[PDB]
Amino acid sequence: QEDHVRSSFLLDNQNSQNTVTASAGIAFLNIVNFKVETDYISQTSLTKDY
Amino acid sequence: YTNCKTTEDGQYIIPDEVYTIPQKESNLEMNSEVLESWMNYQSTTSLSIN
């Protein structure tokens, strides 16, 4: 009796996250006041199994 | 089948004009091939403007 078992498993994972925050605030002597902010978050995940 | 000749192990009747050699040989061959593939892609984009 003979038995031969060959098993090959492969996994790849790539996760890329980018976060950009830009804020600007100007405050004069209680006459002009402007505050703005922008947030951009992008997360991408890719998995490959064999 | 005048003499009702029987095989030595007693499992079949052979006629007088024949003789059996018990070459009881079994050959089994089982082959199994399994290919599996898994792919998952996840993207999440979040944008905030205040």
Which ranges of B1-50 would DSSP assign to H, the alpha helix?
A: none
Interchain contact B26–A (C-beta under 8 A): no
Interchain contact B50–A (C-beta under 8 A): yes
- The answer to whether the beta carbons of residues A40 and B48 sit under 8 Å apart is yes
Strand arrangement of the beta sheet that strand A33-49 belongs to: A11-27, A33-49, B38-49
- The answer to whether the beta carbons of residues A13 and A47 sit under 8 Å apart is yes
- The answer to whether the beta carbons of residues B28 and A18 sit under 8 Å apart is no
Instruction: Look up residue B19 and give its two tokens.
Output: 């003789």
Instruction: Give the residue among A18, A17, A19, A21 at the shortest CA–CA distance from A38.
Output: A21
- The answer to whether the beta carbons of residues A46 and A11 sit under 8 Å apart is no
Contact B39 A42 (CB under 8 A): no
Instruction: Give the residue among B30, B46, B33 at the shortest CA–CA distance from A44.
Output: B46
Instruction: Look up residue A31 and give its two tokens.
Output: 């006459």
Calpha distance B50→B47 (Å, rounded): 10
